[PDB]
Design a protein around this ligand. Structure first.
Ligand SMILES: Cc1cc(Nc2ncc3cc(-c4c(Cl)cccc4Cl)c(=O)n(C)c3n2)ccc1F
Length: 268
C-alpha cells in the first residue's frame, strides 16, 4: 500500500533510548532532510509476525498526540517502521530535568490534557495500550507530548485481554486485576493513567517511593493509595483517586478524564 517505501530512502543514525524501546534508531529521510525515528528487527527483540502486526496497527492510528507513522518497509528483511521524531526524548526525563518555572502548573495540565486526548482516541477506537507511563510518553518542542504507540492491542471497549502466562509487568503502574489475574482492559489503562498523573505532579518521582514491589499489591488490597503530591490541585488528585478504584468499572472513562482536564487547562 501507500505506506510502503524503499529502505534506501532512509539513512540510519544512532540508537535511541539506550535499548529501552528495543531496536529504535534516529534516522534521516534524505529526500526531505527530515529526522525520523526508525524501528527495526535485527537482534531478535520481537517475533517477526508481532513486528509486522505493530506496523499494521500503526497505519490505523491518526491523532495529534499519538506518534505518527510515516512509512514502513515490509517486503523483505530487515523490516522497518518509520515514524516522526520527537526531539526531546521521554516525559520522565523531561520532567526530571526541566526548568520548573517554564514547565509550571499550567504546563502540567497541558501535558495531562494531551495524554488523555490520545487515550480517549484509543478508547473510542477499541485499542488498549498496556504500558502507559511517563517513560512511554515522548516530548517535542513547546511541551508537545505524544503517547508512544508501540505495543497496542485490539480489544473491543468492553472486553478483557489476558496476558500470557509468565508475563512480567511494571508493577507500580499495573492495575490490581492485572497483577492478580493477568487481566487488562481500557480500565487498566485508566489505572496506569492515574500513576502517570502522579508522575507528572511529582516531576518524575518513582511511584510508591521506598516500597517493596512485593508489597504493592498487598497495600492496594488493604486500600492504601499514594497520597496527594505537594502542589497537586485537589481536583487533579480526586481524578487520580478515581483512576485507582479497585473495581475497573468504577474508574472513569478517558472521555470523562479528557473533558475534566481540557476544562481545567482552559480555565487556568
Ligand atoms: C532524544 C530522544 C528522542 C526520542 N524520540 C523518539 N521519537 C520517536 C520515536 C518513535 C518510536 C516508535 C517507533 Cl520508531 C515505531 C513504532 C512506535 C513508536 Cl512510538 C519510538 O519507539 N521511540 C523511542 C521514539 N523516540 C527518544 C529518546 C531520546 F533519548
Amino acid at each position: 500500500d501507500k505506506w510502503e517505501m524503499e529502505r534506501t530512502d532512509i539513512t540510519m543514525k544512532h540508537k535511541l533510548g539506550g535499548g529501552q524501546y528495543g531496536e529504535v534508531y534516529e534516522g534521516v529521510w534524505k529526500k526531505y532532510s527530515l529526522t525520523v525515528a526508525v524501528k527495526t528487527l535485527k537482534e531478535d527483540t520481537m517475533e517477526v509476525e508481532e513486528f509486522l502486526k505493530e506496523a499494521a496497527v500503526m497505519k490505523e492510528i491518526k491523532h495529534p498526540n499519538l506518534v505518527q507513522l510515516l512509512g514502513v518497509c515490509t517486503r523483505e528483511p530487515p523490516f522497518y517502521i518509520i515514524t516522526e521524531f520527537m526531539t526531546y526524548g521521554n516525559l520522565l526525563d523531561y520532567l526530571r530535568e526541566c526548568n520548573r518555572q517554564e514547565v509550571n502548573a499550567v504546563v502540567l495540565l497541558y501535558m495531562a490534557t494531551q495524554i488523555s486526548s490520545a487515550m480517549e482516541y484509543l478508547e473510542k477506537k477499541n485499542f488498549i495500550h498496556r504500558d502507559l507511563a511517563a517513560r512511554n510518553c515522548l516530548v517535542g518542542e513547546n511541551h508537545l507530548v505524544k503517547v508512544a504507540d508501540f505495543g497496542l492491542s485490539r480489544l473491543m471497549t468492553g472486553d478483557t485481554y489476558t496476558a500470557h502466562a509468565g508475563a512480567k509487568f511494571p508493577i507500580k503502574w499495573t492495575a490490581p486485576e492485572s497483577l492478580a489475574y493477568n487481566k487488562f482492559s481500557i480500565k487498566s489503562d485508566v489505572w496506569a493513567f492515574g500513576v502517570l498523573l502522579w508522575e507528572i505532579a511529582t516531576y518524575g518521582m518513582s511511584p510508591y517511593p521506598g516500597i517493596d514491589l512485593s508489597q504493592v499489591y498487598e497495600l492496594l488490597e488493604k486500600d492504601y493509595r499514594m497520597e496527594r503530591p505537594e502542589g497537586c490541585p485537589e481536583k487533579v488528585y480526586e481524578l487520580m483517586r478515581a483512576c485507582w478504584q479497585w473495581n475497573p468499572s468504577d474508574r472513569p472513562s478517558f472521555a470523562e478524564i479528557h473533558q475534566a482536564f481540557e476544562t481545567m487547562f482552559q480555565e487556568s
